Amino acid sequence: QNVYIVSTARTPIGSFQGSLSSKTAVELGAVALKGALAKVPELDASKDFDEIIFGNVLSANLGQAPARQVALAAGLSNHIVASTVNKVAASAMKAIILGAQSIKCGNADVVVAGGCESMTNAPYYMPAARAGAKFGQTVLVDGVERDGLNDAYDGLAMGVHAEKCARDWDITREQQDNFAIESYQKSQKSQKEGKFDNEIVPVTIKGFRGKPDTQVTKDEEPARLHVEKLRSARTVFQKENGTVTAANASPINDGAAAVILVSEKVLKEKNLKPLAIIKGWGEAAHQPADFTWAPSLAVPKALKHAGIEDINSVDYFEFNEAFSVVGLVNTKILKLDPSKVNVYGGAVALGHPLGCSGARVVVTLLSILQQEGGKIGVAAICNGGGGASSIVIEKI
Amino acid sequence: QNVYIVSTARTPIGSFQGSLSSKTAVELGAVALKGALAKVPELDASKDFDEIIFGNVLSANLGQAPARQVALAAGLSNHIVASTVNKVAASAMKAIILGAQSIKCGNADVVVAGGCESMTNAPYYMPAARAGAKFGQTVLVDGVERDGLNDAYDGLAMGVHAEKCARDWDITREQQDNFAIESYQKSQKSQKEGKFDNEIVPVTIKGFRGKPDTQVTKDEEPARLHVEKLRSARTVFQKENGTVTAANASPINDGAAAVILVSEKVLKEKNLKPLAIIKGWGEAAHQPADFTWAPSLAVPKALKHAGIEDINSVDYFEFNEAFSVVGLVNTKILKLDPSKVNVYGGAVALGHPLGCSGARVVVTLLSILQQEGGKIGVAAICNGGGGASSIVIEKI
Amino acid sequence: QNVYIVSTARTPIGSFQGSLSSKTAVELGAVALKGALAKVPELDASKDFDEIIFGNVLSANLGQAPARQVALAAGLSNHIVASTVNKVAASAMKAIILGAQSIKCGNADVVVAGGCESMTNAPYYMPAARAGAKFGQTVLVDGVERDGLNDAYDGLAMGVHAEKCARDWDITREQQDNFAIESYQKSQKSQKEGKFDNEIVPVTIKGFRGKPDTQVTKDEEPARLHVEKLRSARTVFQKENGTVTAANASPINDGAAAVILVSEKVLKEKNLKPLAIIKGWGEAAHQPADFTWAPSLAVPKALKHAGIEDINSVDYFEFNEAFSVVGLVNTKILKLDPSKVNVYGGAVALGHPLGCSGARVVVTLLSILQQEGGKIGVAAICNGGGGASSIVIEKI
Amino acid sequence: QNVYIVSTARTPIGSFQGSLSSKTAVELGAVALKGALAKVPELDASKDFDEIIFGNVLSANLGQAPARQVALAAGLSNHIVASTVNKVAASAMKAIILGAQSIKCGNADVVVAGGCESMTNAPYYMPAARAGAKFGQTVLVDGVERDGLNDAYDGLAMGVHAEKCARDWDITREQQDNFAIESYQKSQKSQKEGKFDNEIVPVTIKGFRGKPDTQVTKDEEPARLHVEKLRSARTVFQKENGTVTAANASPINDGAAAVILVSEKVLKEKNLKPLAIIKGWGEAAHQPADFTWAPSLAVPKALKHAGIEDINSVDYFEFNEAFSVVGLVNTKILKLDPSKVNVYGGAVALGHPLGCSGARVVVTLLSILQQEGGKIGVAAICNGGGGASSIVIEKI
Numbered sequence A, B, C, D: 001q002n003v004y005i006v007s008t009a010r011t012p013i014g015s016f017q018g019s020l021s022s023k024t025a026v027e028l029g030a031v032a033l034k035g036a037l038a039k040v041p042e043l044d045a046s047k048d049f050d051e052i053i054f055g056n057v058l059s060a061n062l063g064q065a066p067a068r069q070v071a072l073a074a075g076l077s078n079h080i081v082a083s084t085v086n087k088v089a090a091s092a093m094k095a096i097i098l099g100a101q102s103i104k105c106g107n108a109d110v111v112v113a114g115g116c117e118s119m120t121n122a123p124y125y126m127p128a129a130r131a132g133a134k135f136g137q138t139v140l141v142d143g144v145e146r147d148g149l150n151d152a153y154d155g156l157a158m159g160v161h162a163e164k165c166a167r168d169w170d171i172t173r174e175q176q177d178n179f180a181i182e183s184y185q186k187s188q189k190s191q192k193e194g195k196f197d198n199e200i201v202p203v204t205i206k207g208f209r210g211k212p213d214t215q216v217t218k219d220e221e222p223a224r225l226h227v228e229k230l231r232s233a234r235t236v237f238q239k240e241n242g243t244v245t246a247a248n249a250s251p252i253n254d255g256a257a258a259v260i261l262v263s264e265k266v267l268k269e270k271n272l273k274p275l276a277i278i279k280g281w282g283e284a285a286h287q288p289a290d291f292t293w294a295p296s297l298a299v300p301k302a303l304k305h306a307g308i309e310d311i312n313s314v315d316y317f318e319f320n321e322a323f324s325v326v327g328l329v330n331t332k333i334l335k336l337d338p339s340k341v342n343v344y345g346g347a348v349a350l351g352h353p354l355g356c357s358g359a360r361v362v363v364t365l366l367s368i369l370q371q372e373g374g375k376i377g378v379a380a381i382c383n384g385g386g387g388a389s390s391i392v393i394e395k396i
Helices: A025-038 A066-073 A092-106 A143-149 A158-169 A173-194 A227-231 A264-269 A289-306 A324-333 A354-371 B024-037 B066-073 B093-103 B143-149 B158-169 B173-192 B226-233 B264-269 B289-306 B323-332 B356-369 C027-038 C066-074 C091-104 C142-151 C158-166 C173-193 C226-230 C263-270 C288-293 C297-305 C322-332 C355-372 D026-040 D066-073 D090-103 D142-151 D158-168 D171-192 D227-231 D264-269 D290-293 D295-307 D326-335 D354-374
Strands: A003-010 A049-056 A081-086 A110-118 A124-126 A137-142 A204-205 A214-216 A253-263 A276-285 A317-318 A376-385 A387-395 B003-010 B051-055 B081-086 B110-118 B124-126 B138-144 B202-207 B214-216 B253-263 B276-285 B317-319 B376-383 B387-395 C003-010 C052-055 C081-086 C110-116 C124-126 C138-142 C203-205 C214-216 C252-262 C276-285 C316-319 C374-381 C385-396 D004-009 D049-056 D083-086 D112-119 D124-126 D138-142 D203-207 D214-216 D251-261 D275-286 D316-318 D377-385 D387-395
Touching: A003 A025, A003 A092, A003 A264, A003 A354, A003 C385, A025 A066, A025 A110, A025 A253, A049 A092, A049 A354, A066 A081, A066 A110, A066 C027, A081 A092, A081 B276, A092 A110, A092 A253, A092 A276, A092 A354, A092 A376, A092 A387, A092 B093, A110 A354, A124 A143, A124 C138, A137 A143, A137 C226, A137 C297, A137 D142, A143 C027, A158 A289, A158 A324, A158 C081, A173 A227, A173 A324, A173 B051, A204 B051, A253 A354, A276 B081, A276 C173, A289 A324, A289 A387, A317 A324, A354 A376, A354 B202, A354 C091, B003 B024, B003 B356, B024 B066, B024 B110, B024 B253, B024 C355, B024 D377, B051 B066, B051 B356, B051 D316, B066 B110, B066 D124, B066 D354, B093 B110, B093 B253, B093 B376, B093 B387, B110 B356, B124 B143, B138 B143, B143 C052, B158 B323, B173 B226, B173 B323, B173 D264, B214 C263, B253 B356, B276 B289, B276 C052, B289 B376, B289 C110, B317 B323, B317 B356, B317 C158, B317 C385, B356 B376, B356 B387, B356 C297, B376 C355, B376 D316, C003 C091, C003 C355, C027 C066, C027 C110, C027 C252, C052 C066, C052 C091, C066 C081, C066 C110, C081 C091, C081 D090, C081 D275, C091 C110, C091 C252, C091 C355, C091 C374, C091 C385, C091 D049, C091 D083, C091 D090, C091 D203, C110 C355, C124 C142, C138 C142, C142 D049, C158 C288, C158 C322, C173 C226, C173 C322, C252 C355, C276 D083, C288 C374, C297 C385, C297 D049, C316 C322, C316 C355, C355 C374, C355 C385, C355 D290, D004 D264, D026 D066, D026 D112, D026 D251, D049 D066, D049 D090, D049 D142, D049 D354, D066 D083, D066 D112, D090 D251, D090 D275, D090 D354, D090 D377, D090 D387, D112 D354, D124 D142, D138 D142, D158 D316, D158 D326, D171 D227, D171 D326, D251 D354, D275 D295, D290 D326, D290 D377, D295 D326, D295 D377, D295 D387, D316 D326, D316 D354, D354 D377, D354 D387
Parallel strands: A049 A081, A049 A110, A317 A376, B051 B081, B051 B110, B317 B376, C052 C081, C052 C110, C316 C374, D049 D083, D049 D112, D316 D377
Antiparallel strands: A003 A253, A003 A276, A081 B081, A110 A253, A124 A137, A124 B124, A137 D138, A204 A214, A276 A387, A376 A387, B003 B253, B003 B276, B110 B253, B124 B138, B138 C138, B202 B214, B276 B387, B376 B387, C003 C252, C003 C276, C081 D083, C110 C252, C124 C138, C124 D124, C203 C214, C276 C385, C374 C385, D004 D251, D004 D275, D112 D251, D124 D138, D203 D214, D275 D387, D377 D387
């Protein structure tokens, strides 16, 4: 059975310890979901939503069942079936895939998919607290690092594996900086031309002691571009002869995104306007250290599953820019036209809230197909552990 | 398409700070999965396993992508597609459901489902660590409590909501103690008669400083039964006129379980012997505080989805005994014969590792159908947030 | 027999998390001591210094032997006998007393006394860390509160006991506010007129990432006076019919002070200029909750020890203003002329680094005797636990 | 002028996380002090006690003013002048010295001196807690190490500097082990023969959950001697060609000791029996790394102050055995008869509660003079930072 997207929304993406600091991951998820629900008042929040599957990586200190909290906070009925999924950066795309599968199987007719992350408010852990440290120093671990940014097998940061990708595929410092700059320039242009306006819903920030309430309305990172400081930035993952910098890597970020999926049956009954159809998807994996070019494996699977014979049939691509090297390497391997890829800018400039980005790219991709006259789009996102997820959608 | 179970295995269930203390959640998951894989050497670990979906509630300090770690640790090929799912106590049953859906959709032919939990090794969190405490005392939160055992909406322990269930449905202290005692007695009898032998795989514990290696071979909790101490135990969630005790509630535990799912295509090609077919499933939810009797909502949905018209057609039931009141209340609402329910004992006596139990009940249910001459079995498990999942299987 | 002050110095007093936040208590002690040493080059740092006794309350994470570290960091020869003393707020005054005793007994001829405190860099403690928290929430204790500001017997803040003083002795909110305003205005005059110029030595703050170093030269708190906000400030220790506020209580602060004492023999042999003679001292205590007016017991003991028959003979008094009510109550009980008391301002306006203040008031008192033409001075300081220390000096 | 010891007492010395783990440093201090008080009922606890000076190294989480708390918990009148002193291991000996000085100056007539330490209940610190860790891993510091056992200047354990002593002074592994064995065997004889019976007062341990209270009556460490395991013990401070082990170094310990000092006037007026007179004292210091043999500088200073021309006049010596190498090196340098040194055993076998030991050795020394028929005794103790304190007593 066909699976349609009828609504999408996302919060603006906040910087680490930035504009969305006062909000939890669940709260941000609620904002995005309320934004999406408001677009489809045909669907009754009190009755028509069968299931929620929501992405989140850093669940520590969020409380029981983050997807359940998001749904209830958004005003959805408590009869909703809820579950939270973690595929690191792929989490929210996996939520969409799983939601699509549920509709295809006839277990649900209306599914909420998406993801949320507050990397700001992910806590520190004390492993030795329960049993005791006994004697000598002990460590407080940054959860962002342990469960989000470091490889589980060698303990190294994803950025170190980005440096591996640079060596393996011959991608230079200067190539990565150029990609980064363009990502920022495209993101800034898109902001100025209102390209994100339909997809973003603002976050209300409560006023502090006589201060008025404010709205966070735009992504925080794009305005931070400083070309000269970017081009001379220190390499943070490898000191000597490095290529990856804080400027050309994606930042640490807070955000959420929501997508509403329905079956053909509901689309009819409810007189909903379909925005796009999920044509298919593909997921692949290989060596954990090679996660950066895993999307190159996933995309052909997605295309085959979608019944797309020629990759040139695809009008636009979204490759989540976990690093500038990720954007470059997959375009290179697949021999794609760069002008069709991340045309509004990507994660290097927009930000990368891990649990959100898998859906965020789909949301932005749909906006691109809608606003730039595209029919077929592909979204792919790599993930820590050596994997990637990819999805094909077609605008209606 | 039909989805078959071809292999199941579980670790023994360890007590809090007990027999499995030296093992992480991932390590326990690897043990269960290796046990299951060994039973089906027809399936090549290096090639035939398309996807893993694995349950886990307390992911803090486990490292990136717990399901990915479990798969790789078990010797599965790194081309496997992996994701981790959290539906609190329902996590591992949800993993099975999602895996079944993936096979039905044709995205995968061989899926590993299951779950793992180390509640012993779940860490403490320091929410104030990142931004600073500034002045005055601050709190270190027990992750087991915050993300596992406390309701996200009112902050109260699940045991407090168990007391609510007792009031609402008129279930007494004495009724709950009787259920608990029987659960222990049945579990002990089952251990003595070797009823768990086919499903349990042992955990090797490394020797400490000249000590030899040991095996953890049986569930730790059943031997702790002391009827007199149970019947006079203090009520821990409500001091005065209480009903729920540490003895009649499920304990905090460590464990894992794995189930291998295949399509009809693979079953044929590989000449695999099918153990059971997944007939259907059902999930429901309502008020978070009413999670205890949510299985009573889920089971009828499961039966309908399975095409089962008469509930008396079901030979055995597994209702996860998160509390003794949970075992009682759902049997009562559904007007079931208690003699068909949790016949080998349940979580009150066996233990309740949250991320594992959803699959653990399915594994045990299959053993019951196999060993006691049953055809149709139902497994259901409640979860924090107000939900429940249920599954119908049929022995082949 | 006779004990002479030959040199004094103090750092500026920094605000909590303020201008001196980059320095440890030991570093501040070294600054003050180096300042004192530089004023008496007739005393050879490599030969002549027999002993150091140095006050400090919050010694956690300062490393072995704070007084020893201060002496060695200031360039004193490591043959010096070192010890650190804690009498809470009276610590640095007790250090002067003990140093004078050491000289009078003939055990030392040259003694460094004083004290230091960094309340900013006092750490949090985890009491359950060593043995383990086991299960459930555990508390991180703010060392400033546990060991500095809270009574050991009832656990209540010193400010709660300041309210008891206000009630017991009929000292109103308006009286305390008027006292605080006057303390700030005197402090502001002192800064404008350079009254602290001879006693204060600056602290160098290291520039970060290539930026130039800066100098902290004056006390941070006096400029913060806002009369209208002070008079409408919240009563922080008692909600209902309170009198004590953050504005009329002393703040939390960082700083250090040093005083160099010599015997009669050394004064002559080294041709030193005596600044003052320590005429005597007195210490007293009573109920812990009544610490606020313990100085009124200590001062008469000090006068007796100093052979001063009439309290009207004293030209100037320093009563450490732990709270405005402390300044008021001791003036009231001892029937003193307020124009003789804390004439350059006091701790309400200047700051109260616990381990420093007992010598800080002696430093300021001597400046007053020198610059205002006084002969006999009395310094007194209350301390948590129910005590006070007092000293009588005579300018030469 | 003359200062007399009229009473002494000590707690048993408990092992790290051992027999006294349920007590705070303050509680242990109170036990010791109560024991001392009970031996001199001619001194009225409600009237006669002018001052307490009490040693303690690790004051974190003890609450305001440890010495004050000890005096009040022991039932002394709250008019007492209280202060806490830290000279690391020499703390409690410095307290005796300062108390004697206070009496000699005529400021006090009756002084409590001594010290207490609970190294078990010294807490962990979180230095980044107040201001925040921001990003990445942060360390919880063991207070025992940071403020007790590690040098402030190089951060190295005292045991590393003990290896420097062994190398500098040609003191072998075998010599240190033989010394340790002898210390244990002397301690075991002392326990068998009741040599500590008069000085030790027991500690009551509260029974948990209805169980009866128990009594800690003897030092915990002496019974642990295992000669064969000691001689093959690992060198813990230096891996290659090491000499210092956990067995031949002093342990980490909990305990307290109290000594009551009086003036000549009080001795006569209250018809008190003098036990000993404090003949004199000496303190010295040099390079921090050379603290081990600082007692050999302090002792000659003490003898000079005491008017003792010939060191052969001393009947018995207590050199605190921080390490076996400390006992050996000071005996070697001062050319003493080993049969006069630590004749009941020393800290290697008895334990080394840092803040207690400086008075503990004086307590034991007096017992030795009394029970073995000695007249003149010398106690000496080294301390981290490069110093030592020494005292000369004469039995009356």
